[PDB]
Amino acid sequence: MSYNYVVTAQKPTAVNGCVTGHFTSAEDLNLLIAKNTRLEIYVVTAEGLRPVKEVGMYGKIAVMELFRPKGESKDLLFILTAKYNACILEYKQSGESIDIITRAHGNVQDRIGRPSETGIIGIIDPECRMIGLRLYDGLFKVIPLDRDNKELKAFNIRLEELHVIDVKFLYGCQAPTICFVYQDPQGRHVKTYEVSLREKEFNKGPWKQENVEAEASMVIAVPEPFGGAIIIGQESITYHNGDKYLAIAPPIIKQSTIVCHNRVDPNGSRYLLGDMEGRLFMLLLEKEEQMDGTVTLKDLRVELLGETSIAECLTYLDNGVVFVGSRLGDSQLVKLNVDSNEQGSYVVAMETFTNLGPIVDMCVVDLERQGQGQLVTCSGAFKEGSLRIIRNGKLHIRTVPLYESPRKICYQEVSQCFGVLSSRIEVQDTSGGTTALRPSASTQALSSSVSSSKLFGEEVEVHNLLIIDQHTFEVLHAHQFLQNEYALSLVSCKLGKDPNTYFIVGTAMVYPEEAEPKQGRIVVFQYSDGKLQTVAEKEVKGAVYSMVEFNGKLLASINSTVRLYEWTTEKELRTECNHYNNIMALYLKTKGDFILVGDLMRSVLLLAYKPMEGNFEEIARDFNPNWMSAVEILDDDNFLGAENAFNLFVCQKDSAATTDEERQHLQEVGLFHLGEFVNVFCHGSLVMQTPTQGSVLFGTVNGMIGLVTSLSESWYNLLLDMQNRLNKVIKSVGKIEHSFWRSFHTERKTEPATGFIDGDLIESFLDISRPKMQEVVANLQYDMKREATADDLIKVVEELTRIH
Amino acid sequence: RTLHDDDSCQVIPVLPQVMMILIPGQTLPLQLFHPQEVSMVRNLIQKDRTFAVLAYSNVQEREAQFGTTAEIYAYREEQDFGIEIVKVKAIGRQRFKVLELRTQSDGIQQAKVQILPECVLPSTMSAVQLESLNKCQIFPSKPVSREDQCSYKWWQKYQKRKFHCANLTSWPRWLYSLYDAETLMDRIKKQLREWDENLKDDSLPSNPIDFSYRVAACLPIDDVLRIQLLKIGSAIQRLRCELDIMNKCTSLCCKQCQETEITTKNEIFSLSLCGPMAAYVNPHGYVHETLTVYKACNLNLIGRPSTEHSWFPGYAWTVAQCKICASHIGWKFTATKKDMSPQKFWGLTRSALLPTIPDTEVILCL
Amino acid sequence: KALRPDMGYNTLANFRIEKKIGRGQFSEVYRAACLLDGVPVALKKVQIFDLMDAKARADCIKEIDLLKQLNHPNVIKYYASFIEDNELNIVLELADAGDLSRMIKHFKKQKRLIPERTVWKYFVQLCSALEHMHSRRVMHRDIKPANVFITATGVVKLGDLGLGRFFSSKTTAAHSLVGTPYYMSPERIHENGYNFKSDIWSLGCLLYEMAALQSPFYGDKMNLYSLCKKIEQCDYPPLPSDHYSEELRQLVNMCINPDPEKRPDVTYVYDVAKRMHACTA
Ligand SMILES: O=C1CCN(c2cnc3cc(CNC(=O)[C@@H]4Cc5ccccc5CN4S(=O)(=O)Cc4ccccc4)ccn23)C(=O)N1
Ligand SMILES: Nc1ncnc2c1ncn2[C@@H]1O[C@H](COP(=O)(O)OP(=O)(O)O)[C@@H](O)[C@H]1O
Ligand SMILES: [Mg+2]
Ligand SMILES: [Zn+2]
């Protein structure tokens, strides 16, 4: 039986949502940010942002909106998690004690439901009378915001439109109304429905305009005096208010799709619109003079302000300062210098906040040889690409912006440099060739080359291998690959009887006509005297997804084959043995002579290299169909993986089995809903080298770095009973049980967690007060078994913190 | 027709001597002569019309572990001779795991079975679809682009937008398209229209679970691969395996010889509305899933051509067998009239063929 | 009407007898139609439980299992065999177009000898059939013009396979021919077992009947005492020189030899037949 401990070394840094209002006090302007499972509260000041309180919520914050019921002095916050855990929270501070209470709570998941394609949408009526949640197709959930609604009793109104794109509660409505853009085989259309709490029927709204843009994806409720809604597609911005239907197609917005928005003025005069390329535009609503009709929009204007990080969300604060909640790169407070003549408005970034997500690939290194490990990651995507050096000493982080997508990374100790596969997007130029969009690591290298092997506007992805120095981080070399060649894998290792360490790259010839890759190659490079040299080349009939040094030999996965090459004295990759399997070998991990092979659909197996046979023997298989992102070998019997809805699982080889059926089947001995999407696993530790054995770090899409370690049965059972006692004492945010949050979850099922210990909940034992520590350690046994004291278990939890 | 619930255990009668692997959606014509089998069907008409069809892995032995439920959609009783001949047409509905086999005193078997669930997994990009891109995730349905399309142009834009979030993960957009339900169905449609020339999306299903089971019935595959496709629970894995069979197993050899090539994928074409493979019935109630091919090799004609019970009217059938092991493979059909195109073709039974990889040295993957 | 698909070719239920086409000394052949696929077959029923003892039944059944495994175009393939209603049923490839005995009888009616080019055309096909059988160590034991079938397209197929080997002759007779091949070899006069050399004697004697339109010991068939003595002494009229070649006639004299060891193996008979067929065609 396997037992593991998962603790968060670096909290998720990527921002998925940001909101503004008056949460702490009516006279305090707040900026609340959602970094997946955490919620940060800030006060807007001339000095930027003042930190107030960060809370650890047991759920992925899917909806986050502020609202003030009539009578309440300050705003309340509504949070709906990925597992549909709805709740309304209130800020409460008595002197110094800051605590976020749960006014209302509940699980609004319907008994049977069809989850919508445009995700979870949560909107609140301007008068704080109901919460409209569009979770499933054809069912609009309504939660009345009554005085005694502590358990959030909800009802669904049968909506005829199934493929609804976006819904928002309109302003300038005597009776509540919801405007939406829906799609049907005839096209995209706009329609309004008056929401009735008494009759529970969607009454005919004030207007409904048909034949809107094919890409109409966003809806914005315009407040009084303007009223109505703004619909934004890709190439046009429209405004609808029954009698009025304006539509503008400026050429400055047609090059990219507008994907995020935020209101600047409470009256709706100015709006911010961010696009996929990180550009920021200002949408102005010009108001015309009043006889008695202040509800008159004269004209719409769009002005490109400047280039900001790739914005997931935007939030205007004060003095032209806008928080840019970026998910791909560093979040940032930018100043809009509109205060000149209104003609030339430019942006100036004023403060950048570190974001390590998406962590695509990473490697543990020791550049200073001080014992303490350093983690260098391939963070960011597109212009937000970067290499982040995390070291423990509270973790210090240095950023190296690449301005292009880093894909893979490896370290070469002999030449003091890192191998980094990266990709840049070049548009198909007017002359027929290709032109780069912006300067980047590959184009601004000290030395650069193109592979000499020979075996309109469309975006083209160009892959390159970067040899970056370990101290200065300057791009020493940038070897560009062939046309229609996708670099997939990269390793740095010594092979055969050759003392030189080589950078090996596995590629796939990707053509749009070829559905599956029928061709690819393994290129061996040597970096000596400041320059990279193409040493060997081995063409293969398939894609080289993964490679690994296996006992001084190169093991590689080619489509559905696991081949082993032995480096000859003539510097050529000669084949030794093959293993053709029923799986597309995507993941490859090795420990000694054992090999773990995996699929994108959790179809995994374990092979073993037998020198007597000179070929691979299939040891065990486990074909449970479910999506995957990464795998790692914990030990000869236990193997870790990550599956579909942010889960972690462990499969074990049944060694004590008698039959071939039982020995050839890996038993699922571990399950845990992590809440993060794991892209990479790496053996190593940030601390210099206990109740633990092994150290497996992991990188996620949200920029969270975690750590998994094996424990004995006695430590596991002690921490499992201690975990239950801590859970039944700690006040969870939104009254969400820890058991439910960490229970394995998919759209098919939600089973309890097993073989895993939530290290974050175990470390919270030192944060709780002494009277609450006595409440937890009461009647708990510790090993002869004696009654556990608070002081002895404080030392055990402190030893668990010393690993990260 | 209401279908059974998932993982629910059902006690249903297994029809005797039906040694075949029925696939959900596949039609099963049957001719019954025994009053015990006829009275069982008569009582099933008064109930849910559902019986069991076991997938016997071993022919000689009763090694049956999986199966498929069959709902009787049409009943027909004849009293032409002293024997009340009852012909019924059934349709497969759900797969099952055999829990118990109870042979009754009247020879009819009763099988307590667990209904297997269909593994419906969400899109791979659902776990990493950004909130800003959720709103622009749905593709616009319009007759100007979704119909009369270039196909090369539309599928490029489909991959770019659906798998845009592949930059967040450790894999490319094209890899996610290999495990994509719509892309795999499109790739199978391309290979299937080559054989079934007069085919359209109006006949093939839209759902990937229903599409994969339809493809398994159409494909000329032996009982070994037919069991393997039903063992696969996920439709993505089933479509990937089916498409790998279509690309790798292009040679159709004699099952008895194993190394005697009879025909290839390129020779497959259609002359029936059902498709290239169709389940015809002979004058004695035997069903033959015959594949319609243009040319066939290593086959000799035995006997003289005949016109009685000819499945293709206006074509004289002649018995064909393997030139090496003399095992029955099919029948050669020659046109009676000169203008009737094709001039000559072969109808090969599925039970006699074996899909093999062309002569060289690979496993079929999921 | 019973139909048992699971059994296949191993039951009477899946076959309908069209008409009786033959009856051997120890067998009954019928032109039957397979009700599963319409393949025309020759259902050969043999009453093994009536006169064959448990040991002779087992030796015959064991040999029939290996005869199904045979694979040659010029040999009648044994599709399937089964015991039903105390009767050994053997399913064979139907060859109702004719046989070497019918062709020889037709040429006798027209008063013309078969051309030597046509003789080697059919002898070379039968030599390949016996070469494959002897390579797998299988004895025919009854090579005769009736068992050498010829299709409408001119393809030769050796079949039936001699059952006579079980031989007993329980009557108190001076000489016996029941349960012996068409061309009885001298070793078979002593009522001893069979050997591969007996098939060479029968093959050689068959080549004689192909050339002279009569068995080498035709005429003596009436008086068995002279026949038994003439087989031992190999006293037969030699083939005429003015009609056939020296190579054809010397091969007959080599195969028709009293000492089994002096008879050449099927390897050399098939090699000579291939050389003669290549020259004549
Ligand atoms: O186009 C196709 C492809 C081939 N095919 C097909 C598939 N499986 C079969 C099986 C048979 C079996 N039946 C027979 O062999 C025979 C002869 C015969 C000849 C031609 C048509 C029908 C019949 C009927 N009989 S009989 O025994 O009943 C009549 C009979 C009774 C007594 C004495 C003598 C004869 C036939 C066709 N089969 C089609 O069905 N159509
Ligand atoms: N395989 C066969 N196909 C067709 N006819 C056959 C076959 N075997 C025997 N016969 C016919 O049966 C008759 C001889 O019966 P058979 O049992 O072969 O006896 P024998 O070998 O003693 O002559 C002949 O009319 C012959 O044509
Ligand atoms: Mg015989
Ligand atoms: Zn064959």
Side-chain angles (χ1 to χ4, degrees), chain B residues 281-284 288 306 308-312 317 331 333, chain C residues 16-19 33-39:
Chain B
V281 67
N282 79 354
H284 312 285
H288 295 278
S306 179
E308 287 184 347
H309 219 88
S310 184
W311 298 316
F312 294 93
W317 62 271
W331 307 269
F333 289 88
Chain C
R16 191 182 286 175
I17 292 158
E18 303 183 287
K19 59 181 183 182
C34 176
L35 301 163
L36 315 178
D37 40 31
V39 170

mmCIF file of all heavy atoms in Angstrom, chain B residues 281-284 288 306 308-312 317 331 333, chain C residues 16-19 33-39, ligand 1:
data_model
loop_
_atom_site.group_PDB
_atom_site.id
_atom_site.type_symbol
_atom_site.label_atom_id
_atom_site.label_comp_id
_atom_site.label_asym_id
_atom_site.label_seq_id
_atom_site.Cartn_x
_atom_site.Cartn_y
_atom_site.Cartn_z
ATOM 1 N N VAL B 281 -29.037 -13.289 -45.887
ATOM 2 C CA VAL B 281 -29.486 -14.587 -45.369
ATOM 3 C C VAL B 281 -29.687 -15.577 -46.531
ATOM 4 O O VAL B 281 -30.184 -15.197 -47.591
ATOM 5 C CB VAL B 281 -30.741 -14.443 -44.448
ATOM 6 C CG1 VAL B 281 -31.982 -13.989 -45.221
ATOM 7 C CG2 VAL B 281 -31.031 -15.734 -43.681
ATOM 8 N N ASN B 282 -29.248 -16.833 -46.344
ATOM 9 C CA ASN B 282 -29.357 -17.884 -47.362
ATOM 10 C C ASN B 282 -30.723 -18.643 -47.254
ATOM 11 O O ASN B 282 -31.483 -18.347 -46.326
ATOM 12 C CB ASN B 282 -28.124 -18.816 -47.264
ATOM 13 C CG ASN B 282 -28.139 -19.856 -46.167
ATOM 14 O OD1 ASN B 282 -29.024 -19.895 -45.313
ATOM 15 N ND2 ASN B 282 -27.147 -20.736 -46.160
ATOM 16 N N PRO B 283 -31.080 -19.603 -48.154
ATOM 17 C CA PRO B 283 -32.388 -20.279 -48.013
ATOM 18 C C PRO B 283 -32.609 -21.118 -46.747
ATOM 19 O O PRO B 283 -33.735 -21.567 -46.538
ATOM 20 C CB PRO B 283 -32.479 -21.168 -49.262
ATOM 21 C CG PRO B 283 -31.415 -20.712 -50.175
ATOM 22 C CD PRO B 283 -30.350 -20.098 -49.339
ATOM 23 N N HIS B 284 -31.569 -21.344 -45.917
ATOM 24 C CA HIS B 284 -31.687 -22.159 -44.701
ATOM 25 C C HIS B 284 -31.494 -21.366 -43.391
ATOM 26 O O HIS B 284 -31.290 -21.977 -42.345
ATOM 27 C CB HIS B 284 -30.701 -23.342 -44.766
ATOM 28 C CG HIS B 284 -30.743 -24.082 -46.069
ATOM 29 N ND1 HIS B 284 -31.786 -24.937 -46.379
ATOM 30 C CD2 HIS B 284 -29.883 -24.046 -47.113
ATOM 31 C CE1 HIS B 284 -31.523 -25.399 -47.592
ATOM 32 N NE2 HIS B 284 -30.392 -24.885 -48.073
ATOM 33 N N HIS B 288 -24.655 -14.246 -43.544
ATOM 34 C CA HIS B 288 -23.291 -14.031 -44.029
ATOM 35 C C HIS B 288 -23.009 -12.539 -44.192
ATOM 36 O O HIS B 288 -23.611 -11.895 -45.050
ATOM 37 C CB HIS B 288 -23.090 -14.729 -45.381
ATOM 38 C CG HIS B 288 -23.196 -16.217 -45.310
ATOM 39 N ND1 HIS B 288 -22.128 -16.998 -44.913
ATOM 40 C CD2 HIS B 288 -24.240 -17.024 -45.609
ATOM 41 C CE1 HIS B 288 -22.553 -18.248 -44.967
ATOM 42 N NE2 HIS B 288 -23.820 -18.313 -45.379
ATOM 43 N N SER B 306 -25.170 -19.806 -60.552
ATOM 44 C CA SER B 306 -26.594 -19.957 -60.260
ATOM 45 C C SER B 306 -27.277 -18.597 -60.080
ATOM 46 O O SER B 306 -26.617 -17.601 -59.791
ATOM 47 C CB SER B 306 -26.777 -20.794 -58.997
ATOM 48 O OG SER B 306 -28.155 -20.937 -58.685
ATOM 49 N N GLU B 308 -30.717 -18.675 -58.430
ATOM 50 C CA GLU B 308 -31.674 -18.832 -57.332
ATOM 51 C C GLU B 308 -31.107 -18.214 -56.058
ATOM 52 O O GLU B 308 -29.933 -18.420 -55.751
ATOM 53 C CB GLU B 308 -32.011 -20.313 -57.088
ATOM 54 C CG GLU B 308 -32.908 -20.935 -58.145
ATOM 55 C CD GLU B 308 -33.331 -22.365 -57.865
ATOM 56 O OE1 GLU B 308 -32.736 -23.001 -56.964
ATOM 57 O OE2 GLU B 308 -34.259 -22.851 -58.549
ATOM 58 N N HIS B 309 -31.937 -17.431 -55.342
ATOM 59 C CA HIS B 309 -31.581 -16.732 -54.104
ATOM 60 C C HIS B 309 -30.411 -15.747 -54.275
ATOM 61 O O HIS B 309 -29.752 -15.429 -53.288
ATOM 62 C CB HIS B 309 -31.280 -17.749 -52.970
ATOM 63 C CG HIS B 309 -31.775 -17.347 -51.611
ATOM 64 N ND1 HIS B 309 -33.055 -17.662 -51.192
ATOM 65 C CD2 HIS B 309 -31.147 -16.671 -50.621
ATOM 66 C CE1 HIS B 309 -33.166 -17.174 -49.967
ATOM 67 N NE2 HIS B 309 -32.043 -16.569 -49.581
ATOM 68 N N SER B 310 -30.163 -15.240 -55.502
ATOM 69 C CA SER B 310 -29.071 -14.298 -55.747
ATOM 70 C C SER B 310 -29.328 -12.998 -54.984
ATOM 71 O O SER B 310 -30.354 -12.355 -55.201
ATOM 72 C CB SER B 310 -28.939 -14.007 -57.239
ATOM 73 O OG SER B 310 -27.832 -13.159 -57.505
ATOM 74 N N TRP B 311 -28.412 -12.627 -54.078
ATOM 75 C CA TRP B 311 -28.559 -11.418 -53.266
ATOM 76 C C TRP B 311 -28.478 -10.135 -54.095
ATOM 77 O O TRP B 311 -29.082 -9.135 -53.712
ATOM 78 C CB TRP B 311 -27.510 -11.391 -52.143
ATOM 79 C CG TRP B 311 -27.624 -12.525 -51.163
ATOM 80 C CD1 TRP B 311 -28.765 -13.018 -50.599
ATOM 81 C CD2 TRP B 311 -26.541 -13.263 -50.583
ATOM 82 N NE1 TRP B 311 -28.461 -14.041 -49.734
ATOM 83 C CE2 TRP B 311 -27.103 -14.220 -49.712
ATOM 84 C CE3 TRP B 311 -25.148 -13.210 -50.714
ATOM 85 C CZ2 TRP B 311 -26.318 -15.084 -48.952
ATOM 86 C CZ3 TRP B 311 -24.378 -14.091 -49.985
ATOM 87 C CH2 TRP B 311 -24.962 -15.020 -49.123
ATOM 88 N N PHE B 312 -27.741 -10.162 -55.217
ATOM 89 C CA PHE B 312 -27.611 -9.031 -56.129
ATOM 90 C C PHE B 312 -28.385 -9.381 -57.406
ATOM 91 O O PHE B 312 -27.804 -10.018 -58.281
ATOM 92 C CB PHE B 312 -26.132 -8.782 -56.454
ATOM 93 C CG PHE B 312 -25.332 -8.338 -55.255
ATOM 94 C CD1 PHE B 312 -24.654 -9.258 -54.476
ATOM 95 C CD2 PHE B 312 -25.262 -7.003 -54.905
ATOM 96 C CE1 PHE B 312 -23.927 -8.849 -53.368
ATOM 97 C CE2 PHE B 312 -24.529 -6.596 -53.799
ATOM 98 C CZ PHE B 312 -23.865 -7.522 -53.038
ATOM 99 N N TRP B 317 -24.181 -15.867 -59.183
ATOM 100 C CA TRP B 317 -23.180 -16.191 -58.161
ATOM 101 C C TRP B 317 -22.561 -17.568 -58.399
ATOM 102 O O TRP B 317 -23.244 -18.480 -58.854
ATOM 103 C CB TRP B 317 -23.784 -16.118 -56.747
ATOM 104 C CG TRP B 317 -24.906 -17.079 -56.488
ATOM 105 C CD1 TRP B 317 -26.234 -16.863 -56.703
ATOM 106 C CD2 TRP B 317 -24.799 -18.390 -55.922
ATOM 107 N NE1 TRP B 317 -26.961 -17.964 -56.321
ATOM 108 C CE2 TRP B 317 -26.103 -18.917 -55.836
ATOM 109 C CE3 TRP B 317 -23.725 -19.179 -55.500
ATOM 110 C CZ2 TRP B 317 -26.360 -20.184 -55.323
ATOM 111 C CZ3 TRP B 317 -23.987 -20.431 -54.983
ATOM 112 C CH2 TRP B 317 -25.288 -20.928 -54.916
ATOM 113 N N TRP B 331 -18.300 -15.882 -52.748
ATOM 114 C CA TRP B 331 -18.958 -16.189 -54.010
ATOM 115 C C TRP B 331 -18.626 -15.103 -55.027
ATOM 116 O O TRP B 331 -18.715 -13.924 -54.696
ATOM 117 C CB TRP B 331 -20.487 -16.241 -53.823
ATOM 118 C CG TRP B 331 -20.953 -17.156 -52.732
ATOM 119 C CD1 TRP B 331 -21.282 -18.473 -52.851
ATOM 120 C CD2 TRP B 331 -21.145 -16.817 -51.353
ATOM 121 N NE1 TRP B 331 -21.677 -18.975 -51.633
ATOM 122 C CE2 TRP B 331 -21.589 -17.980 -50.693
ATOM 123 C CE3 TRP B 331 -20.987 -15.643 -50.609
ATOM 124 C CZ2 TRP B 331 -21.877 -17.998 -49.330
ATOM 125 C CZ3 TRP B 331 -21.239 -15.674 -49.253
ATOM 126 C CH2 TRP B 331 -21.693 -16.837 -48.630
ATOM 127 N N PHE B 333 -19.581 -12.951 -58.246
ATOM 128 C CA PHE B 333 -20.800 -12.501 -58.907
ATOM 129 C C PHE B 333 -20.479 -11.907 -60.279
ATOM 130 O O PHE B 333 -19.805 -10.881 -60.352
ATOM 131 C CB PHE B 333 -21.480 -11.439 -58.041
ATOM 132 C CG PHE B 333 -22.119 -11.955 -56.775
ATOM 133 C CD1 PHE B 333 -21.389 -12.061 -55.606
ATOM 134 C CD2 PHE B 333 -23.468 -12.255 -56.734
ATOM 135 C CE1 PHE B 333 -21.981 -12.520 -54.439
ATOM 136 C CE2 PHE B 333 -24.061 -12.695 -55.559
ATOM 137 C CZ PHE B 333 -23.313 -12.832 -54.421
ATOM 138 N N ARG C 16 -27.537 -31.437 -47.044
ATOM 139 C CA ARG C 16 -28.710 -32.052 -47.667
ATOM 140 C C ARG C 16 -28.206 -32.898 -48.837
ATOM 141 O O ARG C 16 -27.579 -32.357 -49.747
ATOM 142 C CB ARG C 16 -29.688 -30.974 -48.166
ATOM 143 C CG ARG C 16 -31.050 -31.520 -48.594
ATOM 144 C CD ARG C 16 -31.963 -30.427 -49.115
ATOM 145 N NE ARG C 16 -32.483 -29.569 -48.048
ATOM 146 C CZ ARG C 16 -33.235 -28.487 -48.241
ATOM 147 N NH1 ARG C 16 -33.566 -28.106 -49.472
ATOM 148 N NH2 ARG C 16 -33.660 -27.774 -47.204
ATOM 149 N N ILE C 17 -28.449 -34.219 -48.808
ATOM 150 C CA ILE C 17 -27.973 -35.108 -49.871
ATOM 151 C C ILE C 17 -28.809 -34.881 -51.134
ATOM 152 O O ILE C 17 -30.029 -35.023 -51.098
ATOM 153 C CB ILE C 17 -27.956 -36.598 -49.418
ATOM 154 C CG1 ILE C 17 -26.869 -36.827 -48.328
ATOM 155 C CG2 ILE C 17 -27.718 -37.528 -50.626
ATOM 156 C CD1 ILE C 17 -27.084 -38.050 -47.440
ATOM 157 N N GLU C 18 -28.150 -34.521 -52.247
ATOM 158 C CA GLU C 18 -28.836 -34.248 -53.507
ATOM 159 C C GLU C 18 -29.148 -35.568 -54.225
ATOM 160 O O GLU C 18 -30.304 -35.811 -54.566
ATOM 161 C CB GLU C 18 -28.002 -33.300 -54.398
ATOM 162 C CG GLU C 18 -27.651 -31.979 -53.727
ATOM 163 C CD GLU C 18 -26.897 -30.995 -54.596
ATOM 164 O OE1 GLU C 18 -25.694 -31.230 -54.853
ATOM 165 O OE2 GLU C 18 -27.500 -29.975 -55.003
ATOM 166 N N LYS C 19 -28.131 -36.433 -54.417
ATOM 167 C CA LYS C 19 -28.301 -37.736 -55.072
ATOM 168 C C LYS C 19 -27.110 -38.661 -54.798
ATOM 169 O O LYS C 19 -25.997 -38.184 -54.587
ATOM 170 C CB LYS C 19 -28.493 -37.572 -56.598
ATOM 171 C CG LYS C 19 -27.340 -36.880 -57.329
ATOM 172 C CD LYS C 19 -27.618 -36.748 -58.820
ATOM 173 C CE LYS C 19 -26.453 -36.136 -59.559
ATOM 174 N NZ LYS C 19 -26.739 -35.963 -61.007
ATOM 175 N N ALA C 33 -25.002 -31.115 -50.801
ATOM 176 C CA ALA C 33 -24.868 -29.664 -50.843
ATOM 177 C C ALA C 33 -24.819 -29.131 -49.416
ATOM 178 O O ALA C 33 -25.718 -29.419 -48.626
ATOM 179 C CB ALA C 33 -26.046 -29.052 -51.586
ATOM 180 N N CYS C 34 -23.759 -28.381 -49.075
ATOM 181 C CA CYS C 34 -23.616 -27.804 -47.743
ATOM 182 C C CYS C 34 -24.681 -26.735 -47.570
ATOM 183 O O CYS C 34 -24.733 -25.801 -48.363
ATOM 184 C CB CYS C 34 -22.215 -27.225 -47.553
ATOM 185 S SG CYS C 34 -21.972 -26.370 -45.974
ATOM 186 N N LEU C 35 -25.534 -26.864 -46.546
ATOM 187 C CA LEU C 35 -26.601 -25.887 -46.321
ATOM 188 C C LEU C 35 -26.104 -24.554 -45.724
ATOM 189 O O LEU C 35 -26.886 -23.608 -45.651
ATOM 190 C CB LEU C 35 -27.714 -26.482 -45.432
ATOM 191 C CG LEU C 35 -28.434 -27.748 -45.953
ATOM 192 C CD1 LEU C 35 -29.183 -28.448 -44.821
ATOM 193 C CD2 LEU C 35 -29.378 -27.439 -47.149
ATOM 194 N N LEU C 36 -24.815 -24.456 -45.343
ATOM 195 C CA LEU C 36 -24.259 -23.247 -44.737
ATOM 196 C C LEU C 36 -23.718 -22.288 -45.790
ATOM 197 O O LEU C 36 -23.842 -21.080 -45.618
ATOM 198 C CB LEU C 36 -23.122 -23.594 -43.751
ATOM 199 C CG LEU C 36 -23.342 -24.747 -42.758
ATOM 200 C CD1 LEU C 36 -22.101 -24.970 -41.914
ATOM 201 C CD2 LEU C 36 -24.565 -24.509 -41.867
ATOM 202 N N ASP C 37 -23.086 -22.810 -46.852
ATOM 203 C CA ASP C 37 -22.476 -21.966 -47.890
ATOM 204 C C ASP C 37 -22.686 -22.441 -49.350
ATOM 205 O O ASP C 37 -22.312 -21.719 -50.274
ATOM 206 C CB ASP C 37 -20.974 -21.788 -47.594
ATOM 207 C CG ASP C 37 -20.274 -23.033 -47.086
ATOM 208 O OD1 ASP C 37 -20.690 -24.144 -47.470
ATOM 209 O OD2 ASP C 37 -19.327 -22.895 -46.287
ATOM 210 N N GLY C 38 -23.299 -23.602 -49.556
ATOM 211 C CA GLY C 38 -23.567 -24.111 -50.895
ATOM 212 C C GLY C 38 -22.371 -24.727 -51.589
ATOM 213 O O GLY C 38 -22.388 -24.877 -52.812
ATOM 214 N N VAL C 39 -21.336 -25.126 -50.827
ATOM 215 C CA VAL C 39 -20.147 -25.745 -51.413
ATOM 216 C C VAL C 39 -20.540 -27.172 -51.795
ATOM 217 O O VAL C 39 -20.968 -27.903 -50.899
ATOM 218 C CB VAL C 39 -18.948 -25.769 -50.424
ATOM 219 C CG1 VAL C 39 -17.804 -26.630 -50.964
ATOM 220 C CG2 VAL C 39 -18.447 -24.362 -50.109
HETATM 221 O O1 LIG D 1 -26.146 -14.962 -54.122
HETATM 222 C C1 LIG D 1 -26.008 -15.816 -53.250
HETATM 223 C C2 LIG D 1 -24.666 -16.359 -52.855
HETATM 224 C C3 LIG D 1 -24.750 -17.801 -52.375
HETATM 225 N N1 LIG D 1 -25.916 -17.999 -51.492
HETATM 226 C C4 LIG D 1 -25.799 -18.942 -50.510
HETATM 227 C C5 LIG D 1 -25.275 -18.805 -49.264
HETATM 228 N N2 LIG D 1 -25.412 -19.981 -48.554
HETATM 229 C C6 LIG D 1 -26.018 -20.828 -49.385
HETATM 230 C C7 LIG D 1 -26.404 -22.174 -49.197
HETATM 231 C C8 LIG D 1 -26.996 -22.876 -50.197
HETATM 232 C C9 LIG D 1 -27.375 -24.311 -49.947
HETATM 233 N N3 LIG D 1 -28.264 -24.865 -50.947
HETATM 234 C C10 LIG D 1 -27.822 -25.615 -51.962
HETATM 235 O O2 LIG D 1 -26.629 -25.766 -52.206
HETATM 236 C C11 LIG D 1 -28.871 -26.398 -52.762
HETATM 237 C C12 LIG D 1 -28.666 -26.164 -54.255
HETATM 238 C C13 LIG D 1 -29.065 -24.754 -54.609
HETATM 239 C C14 LIG D 1 -28.393 -24.076 -55.623
HETATM 240 C C15 LIG D 1 -28.673 -22.746 -55.888
HETATM 241 C C16 LIG D 1 -29.623 -22.078 -55.146
HETATM 242 C C17 LIG D 1 -30.323 -22.742 -54.152
HETATM 243 C C18 LIG D 1 -30.063 -24.082 -53.877
HETATM 244 C C19 LIG D 1 -30.867 -24.786 -52.805
HETATM 245 N N4 LIG D 1 -30.286 -26.089 -52.418
HETATM 246 S S1 LIG D 1 -31.266 -27.214 -51.746
HETATM 247 O O3 LIG D 1 -30.451 -28.292 -51.285
HETATM 248 O O4 LIG D 1 -32.106 -26.534 -50.812
HETATM 249 C C20 LIG D 1 -32.315 -27.847 -53.048
HETATM 250 C C21 LIG D 1 -32.125 -29.322 -53.275
HETATM 251 C C22 LIG D 1 -32.925 -30.248 -52.615
HETATM 252 C C23 LIG D 1 -32.788 -31.605 -52.864
HETATM 253 C C24 LIG D 1 -31.848 -32.052 -53.775
HETATM 254 C C25 LIG D 1 -31.042 -31.140 -54.433
HETATM 255 C C26 LIG D 1 -31.178 -29.783 -54.182
HETATM 256 C C27 LIG D 1 -27.234 -22.203 -51.468
HETATM 257 C C28 LIG D 1 -26.878 -20.916 -51.645
HETATM 258 N N5 LIG D 1 -26.272 -20.231 -50.611
HETATM 259 C C29 LIG D 1 -27.087 -17.264 -51.600
HETATM 260 O O5 LIG D 1 -28.042 -17.449 -50.860
HETATM 261 N N6 LIG D 1 -27.106 -16.309 -52.587
#
